[PDB]
Amino acid sequence: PHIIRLVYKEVTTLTADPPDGIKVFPNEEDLTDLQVTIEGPEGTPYAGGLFRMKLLLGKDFPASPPKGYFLTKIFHPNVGANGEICVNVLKRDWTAELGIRHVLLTIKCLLIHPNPESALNEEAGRLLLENYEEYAARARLLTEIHG
Active-site annotation holder among 86, 100, 119, 139: 86
Residue of the chain from 4, 63, 96, 141 that contacts a second copy (CB under 8 A)? 96
* Residue window 109-128: x/- pattern of binding to a second copy, with contact defined by CB under 8 A: x--xx---------------
CB 127 within 8 A of CB 93: no
Q: Which of 6, 9, 99, 137 binds a second copy (CB under 8 A)?
A: 99
Whether 109 is catalytic is no
Nearer to ligand PA0, 7 or 65 (CB): 65
Q: Please, which residues have CB within 8 angstroms of residue 147's CB and are 6 or more apart in sequence?
A: 40, 46, 48, 49, 50, 51, 72
Is 20 one of the binding residues for a second copy (CB under 8 A)?
yes
The number of C-alpha atoms within 13 Å of 56 and in the hemisphere containing its C-beta is: 11
Alpha helices in the chain (DSSP H): 2-16, 88-93, 100-112, 122-130, 132-146
CA 31/CA 56 separation, integer angstroms = 9
Enumerate residues 77-136 that contact Cl ion by CB under 5 A: 80, 82, 84
**Interface with a second copy by CB under 8 A: which residues?**
17, 19-20, 41-44, 47, 89-90, 92-93, 95-99, 101-102, 105-106, 108-109, 112-113
